[PDB]
Design a protein around this ligand. Structure first.
Ligand SMILES: Nc1ncnc2c1ncn2[C@@H]1O[C@H](COP(=O)(O)OP(=O)(O)NP(=O)(O)O)[C@@H](O)[C@H]1O
Ligand SMILES: [Zn+2]
Length: 207
């Protein structure tokens, strides 16, 4: 396993998108000893969602010992992303190919007129660094068009919102926009950007 590609996952709260990352993607990576770093922005007072899936890096010991990492980002900032990304490049040097998992990727991948070098690298030179990406967001138009262009794989859950549907058609695939509308709950459509193919996936087993 050498997960250095870019996967974008679109889905609103309650769609089943988070259950797919949290209870499929993350555990498959863990099972294969593939390191990951989670950029988590949703601070609840009982700590956040992914707190269960990795460790907060504080000490010199953590730096060298902790392969599965959770980062709390209250910054939500280009200055923070530069660090997260430099940090990630180094994490891969230590552990081999790692996956940067960014929940609410809006915070760093939204339309900006001037793109920071770390963002440009993440989008264009991720394979050079040995960092796969999983970029998660609620609505397709949350992210800059160039994300969809640079992705290997785009995963979408059901949406009825017409501006969303129109954006999919304009930036990704007209056919994907037609089929997204037909998705039953917890089903997801996968657009493979390399092969240009669409497949509809059944809901993953849940408890
Ligand atoms: N494949 C599935 N089959 C059956 N139930 C599911 C499935 N996926 C998600 N659910 C359930 O639907 C609800 C919403 O799931 P989901 O959208 O993944 O998370 P969410 O709304 O973002 N909440 P959270 O993960 O707690 O932040 C959860 O109660 C899940 O337990
Ligand atoms: Zn962040």
């Amino acid at each position: 396993m050498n997960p250095d590609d870019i996967v974008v996952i679109i889905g609103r709260k309650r769609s089943g998108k988070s259950y797919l990352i949290k209870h499929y993607f993350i555990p498959v990576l863990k099972a294969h000893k593939i390191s990951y770093i989670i950029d988590d922005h949703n601070l609840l007072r009982s700590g956040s969602e992914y707190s269960k899936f990795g460790y907060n890096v504080v000490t010199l010991s953590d730096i060298v010992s902790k392969q599965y990492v959770v980062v709390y980002d209250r910054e939500k900032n280009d200055v923070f992303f530069e660090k997260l990304w430099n940090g990630a490049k180094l994490h891969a040097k230590k552990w081999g190919t790692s996956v940067l998992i960014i929940d609410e990727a809006y915070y760093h991948f939204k339309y900006r007129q001037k793109v920071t070098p770390a963002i440009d690298e993440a989008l264009h030179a991720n394979r050079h660094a040995g960092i796969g990406l999983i970029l998660s967001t609620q609505r397709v138009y949350d992210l800059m068009p160039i994300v969809y262009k640079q992705a290997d794989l785009i995963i979408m859950f059901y949406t009825r919102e017409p501006n969303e549907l129109k954006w999919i058609s304009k930036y990704i695939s007209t056919e994907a926009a037609e089929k997204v509308k037909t998705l039953k709950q917890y089903y997801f459509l996968i657009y493979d950007v390399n092969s240009q193919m669409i497949k509809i996936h059944k809901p993953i087993h849940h408890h």
